[PDB]
């Protein structure tokens, strides 16, 4: 059947939709379709290209209030790519507290982690029951499932600037050094390449967590 209303969604609403590039973009909800128990959402992007999307692949174009966000909430967030910024899907790992200077910790679908503000987040419209089950990468999906279900039990390595450790990259161990700590994240310098990466302190990419 063709609907005009479905829960709190209304045909003609402005919304965000997931493109095949896996980045999210502004569009208009132009149709809502049912096939038995299933729903699909037709989005016209602001370039006139159109997609028929599942409800876990559309997001509201507004910033969610803090009492609506939990550990495990499915969101779209501002993602830093060199000198460019995109909107990319993730999971809420931490809500604002004194130890994280009142920020949200996001685990992105590709395994990147970063702290963001409330003005950098958007809520996905119809998340799955198990919110991690639409993460495509098996290693990221399994890690997120274990993290969200074990919370608040969170094993982490206590690290200090200057400490020498081994860090995983492309399947092998690399000589590295702790450059900085920010809450649950550590900035690692890869010593041979002389470039840095922010990594979650409970990641198995840090040799002390692997062991
Ligand atoms: C495939 C999986 N999930 C959905 O939507 C659901 C969303 C939430 C729940 C639920 C039940 C108890 N708590 N949350 C169930 C279903 N649709 C397709
Ligand atoms: C926050 C941090 N990490 C993830 O996912 C991953 C975790 C571990 C690996 C990995 C690769 C080789 N060894 N461990 C990859 C991805 N997701 C949220």
Swiss-Prot record:
This is Histone-lysine N-methyltransferase SETDB1. Part of a complex containing at least CDYL, REST, WIZ, SETDB1, EHMT1 and EHMT2. Forms a complex with ATRX, TRIM28 and ZNF274. Probably part of a corepressor complex containing ZNF304, TRIM28, SETDB1 and DNMT1. Interacts with TRIM28/TIF1B. Interacts with ATF7IP and ATF7IP2; the interaction with ATF7IP protects SETDB1 from proteasomal degradation and is required to stimulate histone methyltransferase activity and facilitate the conversion of dimethylated to trimethylated H3 'Lys-9'. Interacts with CBX1 and CBX5. Interacts with DNMT3A and DNMT3B. Interacts with SUMO2. Interacts with MPHOSPH8. Signal peptide: none annotated. Highly up-regulated in Huntington disease patients, suggesting that participates in the altered chromatin modulation and transcription dysfunction observed in Huntington disease. Its down-regulation has salubrious effects on patients, suggesting that it may be a promising treatment in Huntington disease patients. Residues 68-131, 158-208 form the Tudor domain. Histone methyltransferase that specifically trimethylates 'Lys-9' of histone H3. H3 'Lys-9' trimethylation represents a specific tag for epigenetic transcriptional repression by recruiting HP1 (CBX1, CBX3 and/or CBX5) proteins to methylated histones. Mainly functions in euchromatin regions, thereby playing a central role in the silencing of euchromatic genes. H3 'Lys-9' trimethylation is coordinated with DNA methylation. Required for HUSH-mediated heterochromatin formation and gene silencing. The pre-SET, SET and post-SET domains are all required for methyltransferase activity. The 347-amino-acid insertion in the SET domain has no effect on the catalytic activity. Isoform 2 lacks all domains required for histone methyltransferase activity. It is found in: Nucleus; Cytoplasm; Chromosome. Widely expressed. High expression in testis. It comes from the Eukaryota. Belongs to the class V-like SAM-binding methyltransferase superfamily. Histone-lysine methyltransferase family. Suvar3-9 subfamily.
């Amino acid at each position: 059947e063709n609907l005009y209303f479905q829960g709190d969604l209304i045909v003609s609403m402005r919304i965000l939709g997931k493109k095949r590039t896996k980045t999210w973009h502004k569009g208009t909800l132009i149709a809502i379709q049912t096939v038995g128990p299933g729903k699909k959402y037709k989005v016209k992007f602001d370039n006139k290209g159109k997609s028929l999307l599942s409800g876990n692949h559309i997001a509201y174009d507004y910033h969610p209030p803090a009492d609506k966000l939990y550990v495990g909430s499915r969101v779209v967030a501002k993602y830093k790519d060199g000198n460019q910024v995109w909107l990319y899907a993730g999971i809420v790992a931490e809500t604002p507290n004194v130890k994280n200077k009142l920020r949200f910790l996001i685990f992105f679908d590709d395994g990147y982690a970063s702290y963001v503000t409330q003005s950098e987040l958007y809520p996905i419209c119809r998340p799955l029951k198990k919110t991690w089950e639409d993460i495509e990468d098996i290693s990221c999906r399994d890690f997120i499932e274990e993290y969200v279900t074990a919370y608040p039990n969170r094993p982490m390595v206590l690290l200090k600037s200057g400490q020498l450790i081994k860090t995983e990259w492309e399947g092998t161990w690399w000589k590295s050094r702790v450059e900085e700590v920010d809450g649950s994240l550590v900035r690692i310098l890869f010593l041979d390449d002389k470039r840095c990466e922010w990594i979650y302190r409970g990641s198995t990419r840090l040799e002390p967590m692997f062991s």
